[PDB]
Amino acid sequence: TVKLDTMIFGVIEYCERGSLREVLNDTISYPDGTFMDWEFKISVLYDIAKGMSYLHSSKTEVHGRLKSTNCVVDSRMVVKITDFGCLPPKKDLWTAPEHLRQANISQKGDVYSYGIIAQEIILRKETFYTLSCRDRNEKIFRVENSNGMKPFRPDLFLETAEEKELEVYLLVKNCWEEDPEKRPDFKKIETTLAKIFGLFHDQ
Amino acid sequence: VETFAFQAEIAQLMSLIINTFYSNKEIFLRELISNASDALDKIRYESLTDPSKLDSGKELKIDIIPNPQERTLTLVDTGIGMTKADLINNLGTIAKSGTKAFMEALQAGADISMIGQFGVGFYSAYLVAEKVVVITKHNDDEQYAWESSAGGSFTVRADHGEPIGRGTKVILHLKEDQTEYLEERRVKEVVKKHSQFIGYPITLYLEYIDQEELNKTKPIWTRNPDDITQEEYGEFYKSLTNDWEDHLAVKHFSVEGQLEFRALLFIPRRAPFDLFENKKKKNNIKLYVRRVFIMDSCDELIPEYLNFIRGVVDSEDLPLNISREMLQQSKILKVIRKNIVKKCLELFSELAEDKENYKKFYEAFSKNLKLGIHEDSTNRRRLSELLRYHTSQSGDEMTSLSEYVSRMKETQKSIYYITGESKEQVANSAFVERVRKRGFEVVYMTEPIDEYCVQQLKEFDGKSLVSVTKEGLELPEDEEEKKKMEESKAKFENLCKLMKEILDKKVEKVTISNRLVSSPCCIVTSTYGWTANMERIMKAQALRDMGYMMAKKHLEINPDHPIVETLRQKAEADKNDKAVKDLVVLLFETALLSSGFSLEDPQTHSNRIYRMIKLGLGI
Amino acid sequence: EVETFAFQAEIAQLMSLIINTFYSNKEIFLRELISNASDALDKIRYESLTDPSKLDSGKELKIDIIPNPQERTLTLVDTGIGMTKADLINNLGTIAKSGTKAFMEALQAGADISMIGQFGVGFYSAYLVAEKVVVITKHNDDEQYAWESSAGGSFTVRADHGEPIGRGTKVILHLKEDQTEYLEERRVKEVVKKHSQFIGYPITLYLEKEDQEELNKTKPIWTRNPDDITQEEYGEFYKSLTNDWEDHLAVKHFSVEGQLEFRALLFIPRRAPFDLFENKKKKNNIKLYVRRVFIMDSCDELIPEYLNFIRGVVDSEDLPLNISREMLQQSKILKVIRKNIVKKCLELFSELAEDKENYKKFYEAFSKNLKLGIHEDSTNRRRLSELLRYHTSQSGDEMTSLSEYVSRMKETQKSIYYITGESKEQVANSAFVERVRKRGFEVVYMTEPIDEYCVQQLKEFDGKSLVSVTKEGLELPEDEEEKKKMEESKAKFENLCKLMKEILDKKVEKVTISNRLVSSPCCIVTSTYGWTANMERIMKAQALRDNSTMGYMMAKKHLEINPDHPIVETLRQKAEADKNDKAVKDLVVLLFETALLSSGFSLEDPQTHSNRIYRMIKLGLGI
Amino acid sequence: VDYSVWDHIEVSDDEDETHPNIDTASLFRWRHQARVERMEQFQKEKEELDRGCRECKAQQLRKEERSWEQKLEDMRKKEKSMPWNVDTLSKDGFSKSIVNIKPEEAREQKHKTFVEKYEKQIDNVHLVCEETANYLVIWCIDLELMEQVAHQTMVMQFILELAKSLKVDPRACFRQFFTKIKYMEGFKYELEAFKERVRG
């Protein structure tokens, strides 16, 4: 006379955040005040780093569309790098000048896109925000001059108040050079991120 | 520098073979019958070229005889036999088989197939015995006797007395602690479990003498179609599934190539009672090679959501193990799944071309179909096509989603729906006034598992979907309507805020909606979040829990009733009247109860209604 | 006449069988050699125990592994005892002749060593991944010797190669063409992380230049006497054994000597995992060790299902295990261990039962698992009953056990009471308890579905029965004055009962009057057998099964009316005045509808109720 | 004797790659697309290698032809070095399907024949009917061994009542009662009630 319980189907984690960009807008979904810290940023960058490191090992090591609105965060505090987006002339600040010059999305575009998304996620501001101008067409036009004689990068000149991630700032400076040759591999990034996460985890 | 040959001690290998090679006890019978079987088809092949080979006997039978008073077991078969040369080296050598030599000398084409490629089968019989004796007669050699007792020395001799025609008689002495293998139930169970698909009859003797047969069913999938008929399929299904009802769907499958196999798949009529109750280890699909039972208990063989289909798969060659229970390099076992599921799914299409039989099929297997369309992350698109659902403007029947899309109105880019608890609830609910006023269609949702599927089914042939119980529905209007209600917001502005202080929290934003023509108010849920059914279903799961996903709430108000304009006039009169307070809280209570959401404390509502009715009563 | 010969064996097919069709994976080949070095190390130590003069040929006893990808070679260098010409031409060159067993048997009567391996057919597993094998050996007497083979059918023995060596044995493996995946750095620690962690000799690993990671740091402690252990060492061993960052909660040391000797360490966790009931991976939280080697894990017939959080290890020796080194034949022996393990787990729980806030945390963590264990097992109810705690009404916030409630009973009643609801506020103020509250009795609460699951199978406690406050047949011991009061009440209200039956019926079996309401007009009660309202609500939603015939024979209700309120008196006087009016119909349907709403069931349609109250308010506002 | 052809196969995707950072729905498509483009590029490579020698076909030309011949040798070498897919191990041989569409006296027969044969005999619930139960009760009333025959009568009569409650044929509705009996107080109460009914 007992139903004999059993057959728990669990549950999928409820889908919610869909762009990793709309999270950076509303305090209702996630407060923008004192809730802002550094352990969240190092954690999310760490998950992106390990995901990219695993992805780049296999035969599908080339992604081609490194884009934050592609990245998704669920409600288990986990991050996924999906396809989502599913010839494309779709110009954006997020593409590397190596595409705008001739062709052939490759490693260097992935490194450049990683740099710009890291910038956008640390500073918490608009896409490629510059205090000098706020119109999109001249943003694209200046990008068209990125192969000129002076670089034009996201605003991370100076002032720290934090020290700490001085290494990570060295990486983000490394990602912003016209020459695509010297750009580092994933190894230094993931090692430094793992060491910082461990320093923040043993406490 | 010197070169030396390889050595191998014999004595310790003898105990190595009989102690740590197998794990159970019910396999020596299978080994012995397999040996008798290969002898049988050996002499059978020898017959077609020489009839005189069968002068010493025209019948091919295998029999087993127990005897309790001597505690002895006897196996009798008529086959090829041995000569003196065979007995000395073929049997007395560890890890050597005459089958391979015979088939290599027979390198003139393949017409028959036999088993045995290792050469340690015989000594397994020594697991539960002390003395083994073999009596052998050959077509051109005299009667010979062989005896052994696992000591390192074996005995051969010329025996006299009790002449036989030809063949082999094997007599096994038994232990004292293995008496249990001398009864009818155990031998019947073992023989029906392990070796019940051999192309020769097997009998058994119990002592008035008795005559009976342990297996009298023939293999079926070895004959080509265009000869088999429906009645044979029905009889085979009845024999295999030990039931009384017939089958519903049959399919035959055959492949080729380096990996070759044959398959039969069956779909039944009525649903089994203990289907998802599990507990019992799955025993649906069996695997065989050359008609001996190898593996069962499907683990990666077939997906979990198709655990209702019986069938049989036969192979020809496979990398087996020293002990024949497992399969080396299990990855190959995966591949067959890709060749099975697909093909099986094909059947589901062919059944759809006739009307009523598909209703009969759906009525019991809807739940399996829903679990499949949920879990199958790759073939979701194919599975989503063959669903059948209720709808508003039909009768009592169900239609297909494509038929639904075939009648879009003119400027309609979305498909609406609604989930609930029963038909009569969503039939006259408070959300379905304007969508029927303008003239459109709705799809009703009624099962607890159904609400999972819609959670994953977001798109269908270029059109998205929205839920009628979410904030921000968009449907077409015309310019007079738009000017009319935007000037309507310019009237309740003060009203738009007053509820805010009365109900403080547990309300976020209040606006004037356009979905109500016969009800004043309703409660709407946010976009990112759940519905009420989601909350109650989660509260139904008892083995789980966290939290923190509860969606926000919104409240709606209608501009047509006289009640709301009376509230407006009383509110603009003053802000210090308790009449507006109590009627607003009562309206909120009834509105929140009217939309499926659970209550908080029924005592307040009961007391309020009691006071109302008592005051109306006259006291 | 008769003859008696001896058996004979073929060589080529035997070798092919022993290489190509015996194992279920290809990672074993490292494990075999790593194991087969330590035994020789032990022989060195034991032989040196008596002769000090063997201290002048070497003081280091280790094992080193060197890979090489320019030349595609692997080297395993050990400092073992080695062999001479006779053993090299005798022991290694033949199948199934183990020197370990001979060495063990030759010396006895008070020895202490358990060398790994008795079959003698293990070394050839080196041919699983490679193409040529070579062994360099110099034991203690003559020059070094080399042995080269390729599993062809003839091996080669060679004299000194001119390499100056002190002692030990080197095994050099020539890797195949495609198996270079066994050369990069990751899989080395991945493989050695699982099998051969607990071995009593240090292990190093060389990679490059500008010594490195030693893949062993933790000497196992279960081999020691559990009488001078301390908390800190036990804690750091806990931290080493599993990946976490918190200290332990409680531990238990277990040892049985007799027909079967076996020892065990068991831990309870601290934070409950978030996937304790997630599918797949089964019950796996326990590892099986024999002779300091891992065999297998995640076998269901080891621990009862309702225990999926205890973490530890059980180790023993002298067990019958098969060739593949992945299971244990004669499964009968495996069944005996659980009957002791579960008893020791219950003993640990009972000992923990003496602590206050540790038990608070433990209960808050695993209430559901404890109650599932209560429901499932049919043998340990008497013991698992004492570990349950509940809410009450006389203590409030703080918890209580059934023993305290038994200890402070009133001296007249012979029953225990309970009530199952949705949350605390649902039943803290409901209409089902007023008379009990007035008298001064104690009613226990219940607020989780697993409590609902476990309450059905429970039958009594210390000889007292459990009765519901939501079922027909509830009485309190009172004086017969109240009895004749109800008597003349029945004699005074029968026609009202008939009317309440004949109003619309089809929903109520009978209408009765009892003493459980003092501040409410009407209430709903269930029958002596069948499901409750909460039962229907919980079982109507979860899972996939759908057949309500059972509920069709576990669902029936009765209505109760309190004949004290003024409203009942008014409706009754209008009733006996006349019964053909419509106002009586309106009032009775309203009362029944609000009773159904307050009972706990689900209304078949709230729209009609909403329309009724809306009409009432419309008339009240005078529109 | 030897098994070496079954050591290198590739799975499109099954379960064995689940690093909790990548989405399975995207990884699956990525792997499948990678395999198909690899197939296509090797396909064009064989066409190029073929066309080389084919258009090649004096001593220099012979040397070129030999060099492309060795190139084809290398191509077969790499082909033999390529792993097995899921799309080269099998082909179809034949298939077919069948829909399986279906196209007082009985009471008297099932009474007399079944009652006679089962009275001689005394699978039951599979074959016996209400008249068989009536004659079993008749045998019991002739009797009043006792307890066991009464027990079987209550057991199969309860099976018939369960079938009536479920409104289904008891011919395939007998395993559920046993799997539920493997309630006891109610069964004993009904047992004694039926015992006092038949004895009275």
Ligand SMILES: Nc1ncnc2c1ncn2[C@@H]1O[C@H](COP(=O)(O)OP(=O)(O)OP(=O)(O)O)[C@@H](O)[C@H]1O
């Ligand atoms: N009853 C029998 N009749 C004829 N030949 C037999 C019989 N029993 C054994 N043999 C002979 O014994 C040899 C096979 O012995 P063994 O059973 O050890 O090997 P196997 O055939 O590879 O085993 P298995 O088929 O059980 O895997 C063959 O030469 C076969 O002819």
Ligand SMILES: Nc1ncnc2c1ncn2[C@@H]1O[C@H](COP(=O)(O)OP(=O)(O)OP(=O)(O)O)[C@@H](O)[C@H]1O
């Ligand atoms: N490097 C070595 N140094 C010394 N003795 C060795 C060495 N390798 C093997 N032996 C010895 O040679 C014999 C061959 O052992 P083999 O590997 O065949 O089987 P085993 O020892 O029974 O099993 P296992 O390898 O599982 O321990 C044993 O007596 C073993 O102790």
